[PDB]
Structure formats: C-alpha cells, structure tokens
DNA sequence: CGATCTGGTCCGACCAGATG
DNA sequence: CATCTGGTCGGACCAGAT
C-alpha cells in the first residue's frame, strides 16, 4: 500500500538517520516524488505521523523531524519493537516493570477508593477461555480496568498507550499453562486482598507477580 | 482554518454524543459536504483523529467512532481539558498525582542505577530565569530528564504524553514566586539526597513536595 | 458477467503562511 | 513582491466489503 510504504519509508529514513532528528523533511513537492506516491498520499502520512510526534508541520515553514524520545508518546512502542529487534527483550522487560511497579499504585488505589468497583473487575477472572489469545485480552482489561477502578483515569489512558505491545507479548505468553495459572491466582489473591481489605499487602504481591510472572516469561524466550 | 474546523467539529460531535461511541462516522463524501470542506481535507482530519485513537479506519467498511478512555493515549490530555471545562481542575490534580506517584519509582531508580546522570539533569536546577515560562519547561525537562536517568525509557515516553498539559499548568503555576522557590528546594534536596545515597528517603520528600506544592497551586486557583 | 456503498490514490490548480 | 513551504479544492478513478 502506497501510504503504507510511504510512513514506513519516512519512519525507516528517521530511524536509521537517512532524516536526522533536528533536522528538515524534503519538502512535499519533491518528497512524495522521491517516494513514488502522490502528494495527497504522503499529505495525510505527514498528518499522522505528525500525531505520532515524528515531526511537526507549520503552514509555510519546512517540516521539523523530531527526536520521539522527546515528542513521542507511549503510542510508538510497537514500532520502537519492530525497528530495533535486537532491543526487544529489553525493552520487554521494561515494559513489564512499569506495568507492575505503576499498576500497584492504582491498584492499591482502586481497593481503597472503589473495591466494589474493582471486585467486579477481578470478577471476570472467572468464565474465561484457557485459550491464549483470550486471556491476554482478560490479562489487559484487569489491568486496564483496576487503573480505571482507582478513580485516576489517566492510569487508565496510561494502560491505553500500553496495550499494543503489552497484548502482542501476553499473545505469547499465555501460551504457556503454567503462565494462565500464575494469572489466576493472582487475580483471586487480589480480589482476596480487596475483600479483606488488607490493602497493606498489595505491593507484596503485585511485585511477586510480577517477578514470577517475569520469570516464566524468561525460560519462554530462553 | 478547513481542517481545523473540521477535526473540532468531529471531536466535538464525538464528545457530546452527536456521533456516539459505538456508532458509525457518516460516509466520507458526505461528511465532508456535511462539514464544508472537501474529501481530501476531511480525509486528512480523519487520519489524524484515527491516531489519537478517535476513530477505527479500514479500507472499504464505515469508520467505527471509538470510546476514547478505551483506545486515546496520553495525548488527548489537552483534548480532555478543552471539551469538558468543569472537570479541568479535577483532570489536574490527577495528572500531578499521576506526575508524583509515578515520579517516585524512576525518580528513586534512576538515583540507584545512574545517579551519575541523575545528577546531571538536577544540574539544570541551577541557571535559570526566574521566569515562570523558563522554570516550567526546566521542571518538565527535570522530570522527564529524571525518568530516562532510571533506564526505562518507558517512563521518559509517559512523561512525553504528559508534557503538553503538564507545562500549561506550569506556566500558570510558575508565575507565582513561593512556587518557584519551593522546586529549587525539591530539585536541590533531591540532588543531596542523591549524592547521600540516601535512597530511602526519596519517597517521603517526592511525596511532600507533591502535597506542598500541590497547595499552593490550590491557593492559586482558589 | 451484480450492484452499490465505502475507503484509498492520483491530478493539477489555487489559497495562503514564512521569510529573503 | 518573489518564492519557498504547507493548506485546500474538486471532481476522476481504483479497490475492499456485503
Ligand atoms: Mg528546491
């Protein structure tokens, strides 16, 4: 696809720097020529891309082209995957940390502000494929959901910009079984510790969790 | 400007259930006469709405119109805060909750796994206008400098989400002088705290300053 | 040889900021 | 005011989906 290969080409260009951060994007006219689409094509790629904060248009003035790690959002996590394989793992894991170490945050929340609330998330934990797929979805919409149970919405946009990658790499991990079971018992250990309102423990746990969680994970890529 | 138009339009229509979530986005071709500009700008608009997670666009089927708190990432931050007026002071408190909480974690990583760097952005606490407008952008860059000095970029990207609300808020915040004073503070005792190694103490100020600094902004809009 | 609704791409002309 | 750059027109033509 034209628009296709046309934000692939700029992004690839801007990654490898073919179009240096700080520096300006050729303009339209002759870019879209040196790319084979047509200006109206590469117009709206520069809008999206725009959006993503790979650069930034201004009516009459060039094109700036942008350093993301300082205008781009949690949005762009999937493609820092795709152009850095061999980072990947890393950045995996690092990905995982934040969801553990900010979601014992809202969590710890969320039992304190709406238990009602977030039992009724933890509810779907139950009636639940053992399928993969499925509980990668479940997994997010937990997460997902506690951080919006905690009252502070923008965790919950937070998640938002996590869910790309975090399901692609939840896809592959809950392949496994004994990672659906972790899952599981994490979740009704939650739901236990809202319950009994011992809120003290969350952190515990939730880094638990994590670690062991983390673990599998590890010897599944290993 | 068309454009312009256009995209607050669409918003606007999604916002106040005018093109509910849930639903389908009229046609191109007739929403864009609909609207008053034509197909090729309208198509613009919806590439870029479709990014920020506003729409689901798939070749040859209606564009589906989206729950924003589902699929919109940390960008739609100053979205957010345009549409609902009301809510605005509420959106803040969250987001520097948000900015606190979340802090602490690559605040105190970032003084464990290179304090060496940490202790390079603190730096730019010195030399600096006392001018609301310059601390604003310094305060970001020391947060957002912090977060990438804890080696989880993750962090720096979610602060990057953050930026555009955060330093609105600043600017209007920072032109009070017992503000500007009180961050030298944070950012000094922080660089202390650092060169102490007193890593178990970041919590119990990071935390403080949030609440003290959090008061003044209360007086300040009260 | 289905008919039709909807998006994607292409042209080439013109409006309109930014700046020498 | 010249020309560089982006922004908007419209109204032809290709292509997926039911
Ligand atoms: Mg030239």
Redesign the interface.
Same mark, same amino acid.
Request: include cysteine; aromatic fraction near 10%; glycine fraction near 8%.
């Given at each position: 696809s034209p628009a296709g290969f046309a934000e692939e080409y700029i992004i690839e260009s801007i990654w490898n720097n073919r179009f240096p951060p700080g520096t300006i994007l050729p303009a339209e006219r002759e870019l879209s020529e040196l790319i084979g689409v047509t200006r109206?094509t590469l117009?709206?790629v520069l809008?999206?891309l725009?959006?993503?904060?790979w650069l930034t248009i201004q009516h009459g003035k060039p094109t700036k082209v942008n350093n993301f790690?300082?205008? !781009?959002? %949690?949005?762009? %996590?999937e493609t820092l995957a795709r152009l850095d394989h061999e980072s990947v793992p890393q950045l995996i894991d690092? %990905?995982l !940390?934040?969801r553990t170490?900010?979601s014992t945050?809202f969590i710890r929340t969320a039992f304190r502000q709406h238990p009602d609330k977030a039992q009724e998330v933890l509810a779907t934990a139950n009636e639940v494929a053992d399928h993969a797929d499925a509980f990668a979805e479940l997994d997010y919409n937990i997460f997902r959901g506690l951080a919006?149970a905690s009252g502070?919405?923008?965790?919950?946009?937070?998640l938002?910009?996590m869910?790309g990658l975090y399901t692609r790499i939840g896809r592959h991990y809950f392949a496994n079984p004994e990672a659906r079971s972790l899952a599981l018992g994490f979740y009704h250990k939650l739901s236990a510790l809202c319950s009994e309102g011992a809120h003290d423990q969350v952190y515990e746990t939730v880094r638990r969790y994590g670690h062991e969680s983390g673990e599998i994970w590890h010897r599944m890529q290993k």
């Amino acid at each position: 696809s034209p628009a296709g290969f046309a934000e692939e080409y700029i992004i690839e260009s801007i990654w490898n720097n073919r179009f240096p951060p700080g520096t300006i994007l050729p303009a339209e006219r002759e870019l879209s020529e040196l790319i084979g689409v047509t200006r109206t094509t590469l117009r709206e790629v520069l809008q999206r891309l725009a959006r993503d904060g790979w650069l930034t248009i201004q009516h009459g003035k060039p094109t700036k082209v942008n350093n993301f790690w300082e205008t !781009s959002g %949690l949005n762009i %996590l999937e493609t820092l995957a795709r152009l850095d394989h061999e980072s990947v793992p890393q950045l995996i894991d690092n %990905l995982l !940390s934040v969801r553990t170490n900010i979601s014992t945050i809202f969590i710890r929340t969320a039992f304190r502000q709406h238990p009602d609330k977030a039992q009724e998330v933890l509810a779907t934990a139950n009636e639940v494929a053992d399928h993969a797929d499925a509980f990668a979805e479940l997994d997010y919409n937990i997460f997902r959901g506690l951080a919006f149970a905690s009252g502070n919405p923008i965790y919950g946009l937070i998640l938002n910009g996590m869910k790309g990658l975090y399901t692609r790499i939840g896809r592959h991990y809950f392949a496994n079984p004994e990672a659906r079971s972790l899952a599981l018992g994490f979740y009704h250990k939650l739901s236990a510790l809202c319950s009994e309102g011992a809120h003290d423990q969350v952190y515990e746990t939730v880094r638990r969790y994590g670690h062991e969680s983390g673990e599998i994970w590890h010897r599944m890529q290993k």
